Design a protein around this ligand. Structure first.
Ligand SMILES: Nc1ncnc2c1ncn2[C@@H]1O[C@H](COP(=O)(O)OP(=O)(O)NP(=O)(O)O)[C@@H](O)[C@H]1O
Ligand SMILES: Nc1ncnc2c1ncn2[C@@H]1O[C@H](COP(=O)(O)OP(=O)(O)NP(=O)(O)O)[C@@H](O)[C@H]1O
Lengths: 771, 771
């Protein structure tokens, strides 16, 4: 393996220096006004981006493959590449003098740029450190500050992964990495980065605390999850420009905090995504009346993390009732603030640009005006306390940044007038720009008798005066001259050289001064990042609570009550999504307690069994978010998990296996027509057993819909079973469904579909009666 | 109700004269370089087309509402309008001297323009004349010449409508018009147009024959269908520019010609349309390797009309075998011909434009070159005899029309050179155009000393010579002058007036001459329409048979045999659509006779039950189209109908009613999991009865898939019953489906999905055993 380095250009040789460090990722090498890619990176990017592949120069004889993109559209192409789980290192040149650096690595899970994120996109990076009994989970969202760790098991893993919706996963390079789907981008990390002891040094040093007990860890059992946090914190460090200091606390997630739901249950209920994978009526889209982007994202969070702690739930409920009389002024203020949660993020990772501070400034002022707007008597009063706390940050931004700064700091006109006296003075040499030149042209027109001379400028030559070749002979030896032209001839003069060296120096010192003063206020903002993140969280909380208020007031939701005994009482409740799809939707009751635990639904095929079942689960879910539920009243007992089951057939049996040995007395199980598949022999036998389990060996409140009429006999075999069914009425030779729960099991009226039949249908009426 | 007529403009008064005759249709009133619509038409069209609604002028004091479209995109909006089932009258002005006329009425069922039709779109207009016991059906396709009538019943109506895929329906305005869907565009026709006696005069005069016995009618029972044909013939006349003379014969369709399939069966088998209504793998898309558009349309026709006559089937089968050795040269010729079936149609209706004759000419020549290409021994030899028959038409077209004519006849350069001697001479005055003017400019440059004069032309002044106002004083009195300008001044002269009156007269006489000669050869073509229609039918037939030859050679299809006894033998057959979706598809046998009639499929879910069933029905269907079936060998007995049954539940019971009292010994019935709905009591009772009918009270060859294991006992109760099932094998903790038919009823192995369960599954294994 001998080399050139005469076989390869020094521009290319430098590229290979960078590319060697990022052999797994695409490298956007800045080349002029383009980012270019070389070699296999070129062939890859030319496939992926439908941009033209080409060739530049030679390397060891061989033409070098190349492909590029204009700088003005780089974020756009970057957005595509990360949609396809690709990382890109951005190689720019940096210095005073110049070195080729990587500056920033864009990965699917560390996005903070508004250009690479949808407005309601939650963006998480999760790292799994597997012991083998336990598994350390640690996740973070650079855009929201979130930073949590959890201890979990191997089989309970894909549930946690679906819950977190991670955009990127960090795995060890070890041979005992957990087998898993792929998924989002999966990024493997060289083993020792998940070290618990090194992960503990990193964490304690990042938060500047003694140990990790306050967060509820210590390297006893949690060691594996401490290392996973460590690995996350390192990967953030390797990818981000500045190491962000906005990662809020670091909480241990226990299973007791939220109503657990398996992956399939999240999917089936269509919480944030349909069964065909969209935003075509979901629970989130039907409730998403948030005024802010950060509010919308928070609501997505809440709908997936229904609280178990009934105190926090009431804290939230006290707020929403209080906001009932004052949400229309609130939602006007919030509607005009920008995404300050993301702006705080971009500040933290050294990625914020001049107009972000303008938006942050103006919205923090708009948040300070909510101090009136509303008051109350709850958690709200701690929310209100936050907004004026942040005015000191707004004032300093008002004083340091223009009302409208230029887009790029490099262009100047970012720092405000009067913030720095020197800058104003430096900047003042500008009228002396144009007025000294008008005072000079006129003092040369009469001096030469030519109204065909003006003081011109170009980047290469600087200031000059040009005269035609005819008039070039008319010029004094006071003029200095340089380059020769075709029609004309341009001249320097020492009395504008003195001017040129004054204004161009003033330009450079001003540009340099704005840079240093901007970096100065970023130094300040980054230290004031705690108050900023509190501002973001308070603004978004209030936005969701405001939305909860408006929904209840505008669609008749009621504050559900909580009980200490196993119970689910719902006074004519409704399905919150299907309710805005039907013009008329018929409400229905739901009564269950200790003695009435399993409701066995039987019914025709367009009788609303599924809808009614999903309606119950959705009311229970909503109940524990602090939102009000769609009913006239509701009362729910302590609930721990929600299970559902609504292609086949081992996936039917897989999802029910999980249900059977995880559901408890506090769980709520939903089962829709289990048995479809195989037969009516083995199918009925299984559906018989599964019911013979929810009643006995895990006393769960269950809704069990089924076509197996043979299961009607359960209320006459267990105290807890109940038979209910759904209505079908005769109108005019044509059947209809009023969609109403009715006690009992619907009788047999398929032979009633003689409303258009032909027989010899007695032969049917002779097989049933079947006693 | 007094009027203006001073309250309305004469340009609007003339519109109301036209609009009054077409009160039900939209009227495109040509207004300059636009077609505009007024009053309620405007409001209608503004909504439908997303075009801006506005105002022009006043009528009785009120601003007249208006909306319009440009001429250059008129066919595009018309296309939209007939997609939404609307009719449009095109009001142009005609004359020598100008009258407002309607010229053409575009209706959804009389389309012939390539610009209003999809390439493979079949376009039929059907007229129903209801007695009440009988119903006269009559339909026609202007694009294909098809013109048929049929006698039918009131309930058998929606089956026929769906079979004919009518783009438009003609109903009597009577109060006893049949209740029906709507559908396509339904067009009501003023009662007496469906008159049988008046219908018979129309029909006999159209074909110029004594009565209708040769077609198999006479006003005995066929009176109601004769009038239907009359109404159709009239609507064609009211709507078409020229009354077309290409309508082929007039056959009476009887129910015994084709294998009947109800509306649901045509949908379920996905013959030319999916269950979600697309071209996502259908039986037609999977076979459609036709080189021509007209070939494709014909394929659609045969897929919906499987022949009962086994002689015509063998005729087609003899042609496809003989083409096995000669289809690659055939499909290269056919690939380069145009849509001559439609072109013949546009000629018939006086709608043909110059380039259509060009395309027809070239393709009729290309069709003549198939006289070698292939020969054979069958029906083929009559096909070969047709192509050279049509050369006389190609010759005349070659001599009369340019190799490339202008787009519009009004622009000239359509009639070929040397076809008419006078036209060439009239046309020849054109070099005398440019050369006489070069011989005149030069004779005016030196005569005035000005190289700043050139002979010009504009549409207002004719020919002229212009000179600047400085040089207008330099012009002779030999110049005549007219309009004054700004910089210049233009002059007429009697020696270019003589020239102006020579070349413009020659232009008009030539444009007029081309018009009369073009109409002259259209007169010839329209009388040579019978040869043309035969050319189109012979080209298309061969294209479909060639395709059948390529499919059999390239996907291992075999020529099915026919039997005279009830039988369906299929040596490992395959599903022709699913077979190109799976990389590997496992073939399966099918054996049924007089003693083995009902195959009772039981099986797991993803066991290929449905697919195998639909495979049998599709093979039987394909067998009767002449095409070879996807198998190693196949033998089918006499078949009359194919019924299928694969949301709920009265529509389950409606479709099965139909099946139960229409299926015969010769029918082939397919039933997929009948019973799903209601329960397992009344569901099993109904599935019990329905099987207790196919065996006994209509000895039909039936495939009955069900999950009811209770129906396994049938082969031990009836001779004709058979139990088959579909395989499921264990590989590695993971079940798989080899998809193979196996005698017997699959046993009970859903408890076998303990491959991931958790119990207390003995309680299942305790309910089955169920003896
Ligand atoms: N209360 C209601 N008001 C109005 N429409 C309803 C109501 N409940 C159900 N529907 C509609 O009824 C249809 C059938 O509801 P669904 O609950 O799917 O019946 P089902 O037979 O019980 N389905 P499955 O759960 O698979 O058995 C749906 O398309 C709903 O839109
Ligand atoms: N003969 C075959 N050979 C190989 N694979 C097959 C065969 N038949 C079906 N499959 C596969 O089986 C899949 C679906 O089977 P399908 O016939 O729908 O199961 P089913 O439950 O028996 N249908 P249904 O009666 O409508 O419930 C298809 O995607 C095929 O790829």
């Amino acid at each position: 393996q001998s080399m050139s380095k005469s076989a390869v250009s020094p521009m290319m040789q430098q590229y290979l220096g960078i590319k060697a460090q990022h052999t797994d990722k695409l490298v956007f090498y800045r080349m002029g006004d383009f980012y270019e890619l070389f070699l296999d990176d070129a062939v890859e990017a030319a496939k992926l981006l439908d941009i033209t592949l080409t060739t530049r120069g030679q390397m060891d004889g061989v033409p070098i493959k190349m492909a590029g993109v204009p700088f003005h559209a780089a974020e756009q192409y970057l957005a595509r590449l990360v949609k396809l789980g690709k990382s890109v290192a951005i190689c720019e040149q940096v210095g005073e003098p110049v070195e080729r650096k990587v500056v920033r690595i864009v990965t699917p899970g560390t996005l903070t740029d508004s250009a690479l994120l949808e407005d309601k996109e939650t963006n998480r990076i999760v790292a799994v450190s597997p012991d083998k009994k336990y598994i350390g989970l640690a996740w973070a969202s650079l855009q929201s500050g979130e930073f949590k760790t959890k201890l979990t098991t191997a089989d309970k893993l894909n549930d946690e992964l679906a819950r977190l919706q991670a955009a990127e996963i960090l795995l060890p390079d070890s041979k005992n990495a957990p087998q898993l789907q792929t998924a989002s981008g999966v990024t493997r990390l060289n083993a020792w980065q998940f070290a618990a002891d090194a992960g503990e040094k990193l964490l304690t040093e990042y938060f500047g605390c003694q140990d990790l007990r306050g967060f509820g860890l210590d390297s006893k059992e949690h060691a594996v999850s401490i290392g996973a946090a460590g690995a996350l914190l390192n990967y953030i460090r390797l990818t981000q420009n500045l190491m962000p200091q906005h990662l809020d606390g670091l909480s241990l997630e226990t299973d007791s905090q939220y109503i657990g739901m398996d992956a399939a249950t999240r999917r089936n209920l269509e919480i944030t995504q349909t069964l065909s994978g969209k935003k075509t009526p979901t629970l989130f889209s039907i409730l998403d009346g948030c005024a802010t982007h950060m509010g919308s994202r928070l609501l997505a969070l809440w709908l997936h993390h229904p609280l178990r702690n009934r105190a926090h739930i009431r804290a939230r409920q006290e707020a929403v009732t209080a906001l009932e009389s004052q949400y229309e002024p609130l939602q006007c203020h919030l509607k005009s603030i920008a995404d300050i949660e993301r702006i705080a993020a971009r500040i933290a990772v050294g990625n914020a640009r001049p107009r972000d501070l303008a938006s942050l400034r103006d919205s923090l002022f708009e948040l300070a005006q909510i101090d009136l707007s509303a008051t109350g008597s709850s958690l709200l009063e701690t929310l209100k306390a936050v907004f004026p706390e942040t005015l000191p940050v707004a004032e300093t931004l008002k004083a340091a940044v223009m009302p409208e700064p230029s887009v790029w700091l490099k262009d100047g006109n970012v720092i405000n007038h009067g913030f720095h006296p020197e800058l104003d003075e430096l900047r003042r040499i500008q009228n002396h720009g144009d007025e000294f030149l008008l005072d000079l042209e006129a003092k040369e027109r009469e001096r030469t008798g030519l109204s065909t001379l003006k003081v011109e400028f170009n980047r290469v030559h600087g200031f000059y005066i040009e005269l035609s070749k005819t008039q070039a002979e008319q010029a004094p030896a006071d003029y200095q001259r340089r380059q020769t032209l075709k029609n004309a001839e341009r001249f320097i003069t020492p009395e504008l050289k003195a001017f040129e060296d004054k204004v161009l120096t003033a330009q450079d010192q001003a540009l340099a001064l704005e840079k240093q003063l901007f970096d100065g206020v970023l130094k300040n903002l980054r230290t004031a990042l705690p108050q900023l993140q509190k501002a973001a969280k308070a603004a978004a909380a209030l936005d969701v609570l405001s939305t909860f208020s408006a929904l209840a007031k505008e669609r008749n939701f009621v504050r559900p009550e909580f009980a200490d005994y196993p119970v689910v009482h719902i006074e004519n409740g409704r399905h919150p999504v299907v309710e805005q799809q039907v013009r008329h939707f018929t409400a229905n009751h739901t009564d269950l307690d200790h003695k009435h635990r399993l409701m066995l639904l039987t019914g025709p095929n367009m009788g609303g069994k599924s809808t009614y079942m999903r309606q119950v689960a959705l009311i229970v879910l909503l109940a524990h978010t602090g939102c009000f539920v769609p009913a006239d009243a509701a009362t729910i007992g302590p609930v721990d998990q929600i299970f559902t089951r609504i292609s086949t057939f081992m996936v039917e049996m897989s999802e029910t296996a999980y249900i059977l040995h995880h559901a408890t007395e506090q769980s709520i199980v939903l089962m829709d027509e289990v048995g479809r598949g195989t037969s009516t022999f083995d199918g009925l036998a299984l559906a018989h057993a599964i019911a013979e389990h929810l009643l006995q060996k895990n006393k769960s409140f269950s809704l069990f819909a089924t076509h197996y009429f043979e299961l009607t006999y359960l209320p006459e075999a267990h105290a807890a079973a109940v038979n209910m069914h759904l209505s079908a009425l005769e109108q005019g030779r044509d059947i209809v469904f009023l969609h109403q729960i009715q006690p009992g099991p619907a009788g047999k009226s398929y032979g009633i579909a003689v409303a258009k039949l032909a027989g010899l249908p007695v032969r049917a009426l002779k097989a049933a009666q079947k006693h």
